[PDB]
């Protein structure tokens, strides 16, 4: 249970830092929409979960690099959170 909690903290850090750095990378590119923090946080979530609706995405090189970090660290850490929840659920199947 302690390790699931650490993975959740890492995920939140990735989502927040990804949101901050995406705005920083995308402002200055005409036509970019990933330029205010609340919706950049929505974007980082849609990326770390791999859902990727595509209502928002980065258009600059450094925004796309930020995206890659959010993918690498965020999909790993969301996978860890997901794995922990599936293990806990499989437990109470056994407990019935």
């Amino acid at each position, epitope marked *: 249970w302690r390790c699931a909690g650490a993975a959740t903290v890492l995920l939140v850090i990735v989502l927040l830092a990804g949101s*901050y750095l995406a*705005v*920083l990378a*995308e*402002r*200055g*590119a*005409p*036509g*970019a*929409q990933l*330029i*205010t*923090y*609340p919706r950049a946080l929505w974007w980082s979530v849609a990326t770390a979960t791999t859902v990727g609706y595509g209502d928002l995405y980065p258009v600059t090189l450094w925004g796309r690099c930020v995206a890659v970090v959010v993918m690498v660290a965020g999909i790993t850490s969301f996978g860890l959170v997901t794995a922990a929840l599936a293990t806990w659920f499989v437990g109470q199947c056994q407990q019935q």
Partner: antibody
Amino acid sequence: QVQLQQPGAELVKPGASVKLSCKASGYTFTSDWIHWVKQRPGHGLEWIGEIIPSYGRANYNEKIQKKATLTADKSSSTAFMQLSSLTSEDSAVYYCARERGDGYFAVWGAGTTVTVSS
Amino acid sequence: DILLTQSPAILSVSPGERVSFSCRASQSIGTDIHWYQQRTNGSPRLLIKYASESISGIPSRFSGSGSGTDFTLSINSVESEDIANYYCQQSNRWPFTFGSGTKLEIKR
């Protein structure tokens, strides 16, 4: 209390430069952006540029000539705009404005009246 | 860059009647439009954010509507203090841009 403090006026000779200041108070966050807006007498609002003081990155309106350079000083919570090589076309009121990274200008300075004249 | 058309540039109105300011964007910007009032010799003042959301301190007579490309700032029952220039501003795409402004005039 007044949240953004700007000098009232600056007189600059044609071809010279000037540094405008915007002193921020109230709540400050890392998501804050300081913006600069130019208004010539009898005209509308014209976006000049923005800087994020927590990082120091600045961006500029690409549709007009680049006459401005934006900096910030986190210790004195003051943003600066360097206007250089000025002309009569640069005579205007220059506002600074604070945006919390969510797209709108919640608070504005009183503006600095810049006149370019000999 | 998003062009914001405010037409008409001057709005002439009798006291106490309803008035509507129009702002039209050159492409769809969802609800990312904000409205400012600027009185003679004053600084701009935020009236409405995100097309319809009210601001603390702004009289309830002010409201906004619209989404996509067509946006309206409305004043129910104008009074003399509403005489000013009114600007819209979008935050949907970089860079932020301003409309050219509408002046409110009152027929007393």
